[PDB]
């Protein structure tokens, strides 16, 4: 209702600004994820002293690691071969666990939460595009080659 921002928001905020956001939006989503903090004097002092110039600017640094993981893949192409589904569809629909292991055993540091599928799960067989996001600011693009084992 007067909450203070921790860093850049997806929308309606930039930094250190106070907004009449909704409680449903504040208690559940913002405050526990580290994107906002209620308007009290302890928090205002904390912000104007340790955040407006130090912690926000350190949060600007991890943008470097984000842009790094954006293109860490020396191949930028991951081939998965599981099984041929009778010349047609695929047996095991590739989701998030099928890729979070092929990336960790390949070197690209990506978690089950960093993957973002455009249209649900893929159930075809063919080399298709998927978008990766290591950060709300850094969106990568890595191609996948769907093969059969």
């Amino acid at each position: 209702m007067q909450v203070i921002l921790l860093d850049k928001v997806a929308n309606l905020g930039s930094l250190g600004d106070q907004v009449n956001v909704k409680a449903g939006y504040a208690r559940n989503f913002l405050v526990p994820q580290g994107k906002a903090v209620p308007a009290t004097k302890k928090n205002i002092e904390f912000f104007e002293a340790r955040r407006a110039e130090l912690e926000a600017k350190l949060a600007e640094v991890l943008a470097a690691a984000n842009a790094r993981a954006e293109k860490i893949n020396a191949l930028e192409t991951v081939t998965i071969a599981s099984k041929a589904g009778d010349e047609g569809k695929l047996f095991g629909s590739i989701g998030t666990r099928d890729i979070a292991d092929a990336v960790t055993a390949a070197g690209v540091e990506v978690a089950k939460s960093e993957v973002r599928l455009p249209n649900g799960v893929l159930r075809t067989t063919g080399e298709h595009e998927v978008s990766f996001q290591v950060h709300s600011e850094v969106f990568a693009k890595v191609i996948v080659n769907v093969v059969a084992e």
Partner: protein
């Protein structure tokens, strides 16, 4: 028991006076729900059985204070 874990709000009786004052008996209960608050000190969640006026009370106070209150009151969280 339908009691707010944070305010002690409990059911209280009363009446149900009609348009001709028949005055049957009737209860009054809290808008009581079971929410999963966050606690940074512990970096955890905490499930309570609280009320709407307790939802705004933790907004005001803070989830640390209320916990010391409840601990000195002798109730498990």
């Amino acid at each position: 028991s339908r009691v707010c874990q944070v305010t002690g709000k409990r059911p209280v009786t009363g009446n149900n006076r009609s348009h001709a004052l028949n005055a049957t008996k009737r209860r009054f209960l809290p808008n009581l729900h079971s929410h999963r608050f966050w606690v940074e000190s512990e970096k955890r969640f905490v499930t309570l059985r609280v009320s709407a006026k307790g939802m705004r009370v933790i907004d005001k106070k803070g989830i640390d204070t209320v916990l010391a209150e409840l601990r000195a009151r002798g109730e498990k969280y």
